[PDB]
Amino acid sequence: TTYADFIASGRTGRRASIH
Amino acid sequence: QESVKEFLAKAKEDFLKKWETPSQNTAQLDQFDRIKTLGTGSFGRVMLVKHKESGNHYAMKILDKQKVVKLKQIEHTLNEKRILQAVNFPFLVKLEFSFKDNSNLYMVMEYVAGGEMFSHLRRIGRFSEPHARFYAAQIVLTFEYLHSLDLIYRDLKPENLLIDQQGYIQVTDFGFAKRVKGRTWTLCGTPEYLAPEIILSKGYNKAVDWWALGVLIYEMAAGYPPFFADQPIQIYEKIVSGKVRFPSHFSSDLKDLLRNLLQVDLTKRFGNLKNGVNDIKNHKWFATTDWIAIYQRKVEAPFIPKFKGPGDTSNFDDYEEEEIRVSINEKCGKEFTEF
Ligand SMILES: Nc1ncnc2c1ncn2[C@@H]1O[C@H](COP(=O)(O)OP(=O)(O)NP(=O)(O)O)[C@@H](O)[C@H]1O
Ligand SMILES: [Mg+2]
Ligand SMILES: [Mg+2]
């Protein structure tokens, strides 16, 4: 499922800004 | 229509006075006791503090001047403080004090104790459509306000949205906010939320905020973003492809709204057409929304965070604490003269 793929990904925590 | 027009005219008069003559040096470090870190970032952190003379709690954003200079963020940081001290809207966090010392810049805001939208969203999983719509309406109004002042916000995301004690949103983090009448070019934001025109090093305008609203509404309602991967480069590839898939539970109205917000074509993106923000406010997904009642904070919030008392940080993650150093030598004095 898309949910499962998200939860297994490396970007489920707080995301920093980029510049 | 007539009430809004007049409201915005006065709002601009108020903003421009403060934009032209900004507040400076309205507190100092030893007026506060520093308690606990609420969130960390690239130039420093935000700490819960207690103001000694009043007893009030506040959230103190601390930016290391040397780090700001190293990351070429001087102008952005000056923008952040100049804009935040000048704005006034029910869903924008209030800047109570600002000041600087030899080492750091400080922006002391009202403490919003309910935590980041991010934490609630990840824990609960996703928000129902009415819950997401309640928050989305506040952002729509906030952008109508900011854009009217020629401001672009440029970092919408759940990490930058705080829930107050009444369950309403307070937008924080004006780090990339900018007053601009033409187009602009800086590659900044957060990867998942970047509009395609930012990625493709096209000039861009306030329409990027409306794209980011699409991403936020999708993430709130789905529990994951419309474009996600392990690395930013892979995210950008997906954004530029533009293809969006929707969860099976999304209403037809939600999908229609999102196809119009997550629109690569600027001549077709809602918020950017002849009718401006009204294309969004008048969309079927927002049919149940009483816009003035939202503005007046008269709508019952879907969710009221737990508050134990003054100084409670239970709604925030814990962070490693670090000493706040202040050199006996002034760093970057000329660069930050206006702060
Ligand atoms: N007024 C406030 N009340 C309560 N918590 C706050 C407040 N302002 C900031 N925070 C918390 O501190 C965090 C960092 O503040 P922020 O201004 O987003 O820093 P930043 O370095 O600009 N982060 P980013 O650019 O998003 O990577 C937020 O995500 C909140 O958790
Ligand atoms: Mg932030
Ligand atoms: Mg920031």
Rg (CA), chain B: 20
Ligand 2 centroid to A16 CA: how many Å?
A: 7
Experimental method: X-ray
Same domain flag for B322 and B269? no
B231: domain CATH number is 1.10.510.10
Q: Do A19 and B76 touch (CB under 8 A)?
A: yes
Give catalytic status of residue B155 as yes or no. yes
Do residue B257 and residue B333 come from a single domain? no
- Across chain A, how many H-helices and E-strands are there? 1, 0
Task: Give the domain CATH number at B53.
Answer: 3.30.200.20
Q: Could you tell me if B53 and B133 lie in one domain?
A: no
| CB contact (8 A) between residue A18 and residue B73 | no
Interchain pair A17, B189: CB under 8 A: yes
d(CA B20, CA B111): 27
Based on the fold, state whether residues B15 and B153 are members of the same structural domain.
yes
Residues B183 and B161 in one domain: yes
Domains: count for chain B: 2
**H or E segment to which residue B36 belongs:** strand B32-40
> What is the CA B102 to chain-centroid distance, rounded?
28
Residue of A nearest to B155 (CA): A17
Could you tell me the distance, in angstroms and rounded to a whole number, from the CA of residue B274 to the centre of ligand 2?
32
To the nearest 10°, the Cα dihedral for B76, B78, B79, B82? 160
B113: left (phi over 0), alpha (psi -120 to 50) or beta: alpha
Cα(B298) to centroid(ligand 2), Å: 28
- B226 and B291, same domain (yes or no): yes
Do residues B247 and B337 both lie within one domain?
no
B104 and B160 share one domain: no
Contact residues of B toward A, CB < 8 A: 39, 41-42, 71-73, 76, 116, 118, 122, 155, 157, 159, 173, 175-176, 186-192, 222-225, 228-230, 232, 245, 247, 317
Q: Is B49 helix (H, G, I), strand (E, B) or coil?
A: strand
Q: Do B298 and B337 belong to one domain?
A: no
User: Does residue B284 sit in the same domain as residue B326?
Assistant: no
3-state secondary structure B196-258: HHHHCCCCECCHHHHHHHHHHHHHHHHCCCCCCCCCHHHHHHHHHHCCCCCCCCCCHHHHHHH
Q: Is B204 in the same domain as B272? A: yes
One domain, residues B102 and B66: yes
Domain encompassing residue B337 = 22-115+307-339
Taking CB atoms and an 8 Å cutoff, what residues of chain B touch A18?
187-191, 232
Per 3-state DSSP, chain B is made up of helix, strand and coil in percentages (nearest 5) of 35, 15, 45
